[PDB]
Amino acid sequence: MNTVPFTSAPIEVTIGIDQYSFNVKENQPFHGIKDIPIGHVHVIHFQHADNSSMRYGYWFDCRMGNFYIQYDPKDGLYKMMEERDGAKFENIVHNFKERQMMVSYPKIDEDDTWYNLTEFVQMDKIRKIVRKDENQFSYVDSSMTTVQENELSDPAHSLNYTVINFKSREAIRPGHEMEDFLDKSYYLNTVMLQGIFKNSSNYFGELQFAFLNAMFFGNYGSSLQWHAMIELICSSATVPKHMLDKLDEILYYQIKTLPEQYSDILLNERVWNICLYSSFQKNSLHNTEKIMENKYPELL
């Protein structure tokens, strides 16, 4: 197990760690989070009690270094930093662990939720979407725009998701206009899978990462990307069977985890009704269709 210590907690804040969250009071004796499961990426996220503006947070993998959080009173946020002195880091963590000033990552043993949401997500791929090469962890917030949003403005602070545009020359072969517009299999299998992502695991990783940024930060461009990546598969007549089965599992766990009271802002009615009831794959997502119909029948 690994640990993200906190130098202090000078401002009252709701702290998220993966799908969990807890509140810390202003100047409370809080010194971080222990027992973080090794083997997965993680996200630690923040919403200030006195200014819910800007949710923000950090994606990290404890296998890549020793990370800690310290508040910066000038920029007014909790910042992730890397401690290069391993002995100092071990000593500080042990002291705080002995004084019981850390919360424990509260994983139920039966519970595979986080693995199910991050199965295909890798830090190396996160670090290409979020470009800040001097850090081993990646900052995301509520307001960051995507490369595609910026084409339709500070490029250094952008989410470099793969651009998907159904009415673009990339999506449509000259001479196959009707074919390629009504059946996106070319665009999915040749352009995106074979050409850009290389395999379906990388495509699913970006899809999962987009959903998580949408859910944890309310990042609008991330929600757009998530839906575009779903629609691209559902609108293709020819999809490898293993991909459809895996997509159903991915989407089921995303819908299961979504806060019920955020469904109105996190789910696009057009895309979901199209994917579940009109698309080529309308009968290939049995688990997702069942949870959607039982949890959010209003959207449909």
Added chain:
Amino acid sequence: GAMNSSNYAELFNNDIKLFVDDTNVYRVTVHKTFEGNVATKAINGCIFTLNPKTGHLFLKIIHTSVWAGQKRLSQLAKWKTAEEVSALVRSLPKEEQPKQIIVTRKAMLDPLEVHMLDFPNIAIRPTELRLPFSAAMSIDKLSDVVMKATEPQMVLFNIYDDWLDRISSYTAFSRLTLLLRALKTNEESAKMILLSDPTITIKSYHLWPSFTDEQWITIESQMRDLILTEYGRKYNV
């Protein structure tokens, strides 16, 4: 965006534009079969592509052979229309290519947009005008060329004859739409109005009769009376 009555004079400015109407592309007769089912039989159709400023009409004749062995013909017809309009644009010299293409039916937007991706500076727009271009096949010389075609063919016409020698393109378009609306509402009576007087005849190189200015006023009034007469017949007014 969409084209309506607020920006109606835009049709007659100096930016080249084309209306595209696909109503008459896929045409069928419906009949019973020997077994008592129902079958369709396609007949020749046409794409109606019109420059409202100059009157130039690019009439692409759609021969029934294009439908042979194809499925989902109503959908295919929109994509075939878009393919042919795209081909027309590419065939025109750059200085003759339109800056805007206005489709009469919103279902033509995506097919045309996709076929014209190579022309990002040509705007593809709908219209809120209800334009009676479906009645093009009530114009005898247009219907004759479509029905006689034995293969795909493009035929060029000036749908205004020589009217632009005497009137503006705004007035000419208004005259055309009134004539087409009348032919759409009551074709027999419209042709009667247009042809009753034998001393006034259509020139070999024209589509409509050779009316003087005063006679066009009379004809236009008779067409408006026809439209109103039919409105009253329809709604019992």
